[PDB]
UniProtKB/Swiss-Prot annotation, chains A, B:
Gene name linked to the record: APP
Superkingdom as given in the UniProt entry: Eukaryota
Site for Cleavage, residues: 6-7
Residue window of the full protein shown: 706 to 713 of 770
Protein name: P3(42)
Result for mutant: residue 1 to L: Reduced lipid peroxidation inhibition
Site (Susceptible to oxidation) location in chain: 1
Length: 8, 8
């Protein structure tokens, strides 16, 4: 499981 | 598993 999250 | 979170 490979997850990526950006708040910017 | 591979997890990344950015708040910037």
């Amino acid at each position: 499981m490979v997850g990526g999250v950006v708040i910017a």
